[PDB]
Amino acid sequence: RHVMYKKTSRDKAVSVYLGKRDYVDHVDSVEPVDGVVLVDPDLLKGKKVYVTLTCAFRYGQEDIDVIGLTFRKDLYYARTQIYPPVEDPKALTKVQERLMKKLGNNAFPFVLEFPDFLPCSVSLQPAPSDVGKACGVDFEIKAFSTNNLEDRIHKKNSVRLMIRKIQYAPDQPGPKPRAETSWQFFMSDKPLHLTASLSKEVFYHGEPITVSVSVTNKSDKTVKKISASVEQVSNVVLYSSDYYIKTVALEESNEKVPSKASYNHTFSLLPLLAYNREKREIALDGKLKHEDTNLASSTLLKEGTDRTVMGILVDYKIKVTLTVSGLLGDMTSSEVSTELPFILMHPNPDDMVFEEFARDPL
Template sequence: MVVNFKVYKKCSPNGKVTLYMGKRDFIDSITTVEPVDGLVVLNDDYVRNNRKIYAQLICHFRYGREEDETMGLNFQKELTLASQQIYPQEKSDVVMTKMQERLLKKLGPNAFPFLLTMPPNSPASITLQQKAGDESQPCGIQYFVKVFAGDSELDRNHRRSSVALGVRKVQYAPTKQGVQPCTIVRKDFLLSPGELELEVTLDKQLYHHGDKIAVNICIRNNSNKIVKKIKAMVQQGVDVVLFQSGQFRHTISSMETTEGCPIQPGSSVQKVVYLQPNLIPNQNRFGIAVEGDPKRRETFLASTTLLSAPECRDAFGIIVSYAVKVKLFLGALGGELCAELPFVLMHPKPTRGKMLPQESAEINDEKIVDYE
């Protein structure tokens, strides 16, 4: 039986250090994260001279634009989450994955495995879209596996013998649906009797990317005001926890309707509207949170950030949330009535052997090698 598998390969500028990885997406299951594993192949000169080789997992967090970095300000942080000396190996009893074992047979004695542990409370890979034509480094959170030769794990001066490959930390949707979202809001008026009641219900709490959201709207007008228009929208919330004012909201899908309007005093209306959050109509909008690198040909809106506990919030660089908002317009004197329901938007967990579209495409100068 022949088994095909794909491997990501990237070489250092001097060609003496080569990094191999079987995948670039690592799953965060809230309490644990998949270990980051791969192999490094060294040139014979490095092996004979016992050059020290290190592998590190780097988290790069940019929270401000490069063009605003003046007077010594620096709007980025780089954290080393894990570090390991690959060669000479400090441990002889290294537990390898099946992919590492297969590659080790193919690549020979100069191949050395590594295993890096990602902290469970580290943030997910999220990038904020830039303006069209902006080539500067985007704001967001990116991860890199960096392999380099040096005298210590802090010695990164030898750039020609260094190689870095981008990886992603992703969360997938839970297998069970939560409680069906529902809310009722009422509004009374100072000089008018009665009240206006708006009830909004979603068909479920958890949606996958590409799903349509069915919004059930029930309006009971027990006031003497007239409802002239109904607007429903999906909003993406982005919270950069580093700033108190770093909270943004973007409407990524909306619809307005006057069907059944005006809603006269004493009458009621019930209807269902459908919304579909999608990146395609929002691709050129500044500040929209997307998964990973927006320069890839295929990407998605950023998934909802799941937290194991509210106190873990500060450990996440960027938190993404979604909500459906329904607004009733009553005219200039009547004002508005709004109802809001949060929901979860995520990818379903892929079946075994199935990869996301991003994993099957060639990216930048990294090569994909097929092995049998």
């Protein structure tokens, strides 16, 4: 039941059709943006029609196109003239052949490649107070008509589609994250040993993360609490050096571990945007008002990269923490912690209808 997405200018002259709203970064390659522009030669006053792909960092507002932006940096730009055809034909995708069958002779195909240096879609949801801290990386497909490229491009003559670049890679094979720490308290004869492990390195939005915690308490002190959490750390790397950290999942266990006792337990942590709607100064992969918006993926920096092109560096870790105390009198508590980095990823996005491009609301 394959769906195609479309959107048209107000002047109805140009009209863009795409196979997807979201194009997948596969780490070593990116699905290109292939679609067709449907023009009306008569409405076009002998004009040419171009399509552009633009990746931009924005800071200060929640879109690149709105006025009031403190800062904008264009990370990538590419333009292709689809009409009149400047020949250079290519092997149409199945999507483009299908689209053209149904749309007829005024459907001209295009393909716009992503380079490998670009970031994925990432957005920082600001605090309701500090909305000037909003920033992110937007991708825009824009088709438009013009007599001369020097001329201003009116909103009526153009059509913008705000696509996403989302990242997926397989979770096997990989390593098993593991972290140990020992702490021998003053006048304890043996130490308290803490161990945490994950089954793999890569997890997908919606996938429970099971943390295996293991405590060997040879101390004289008592473990009074055991918490396991997901922490999202964000580092803005363009315009300003904003830092953010958010707990996006937490499971605790008041089950004590007495002196001279051991304890094994698995936790199951679900870092979903569903349970973090209230939170702000948090990194997402879209606008909060859309259904398809998730938490942000882990930033994968590639060898010899300019970090700053990423716009926002996002990383995830599990934190396991034991709260430890004496049994009576001196109740001074102490924490014993271990951290497990992991990669959070978009899950794999596994006749012909047309839907409007606009993304489903919440």
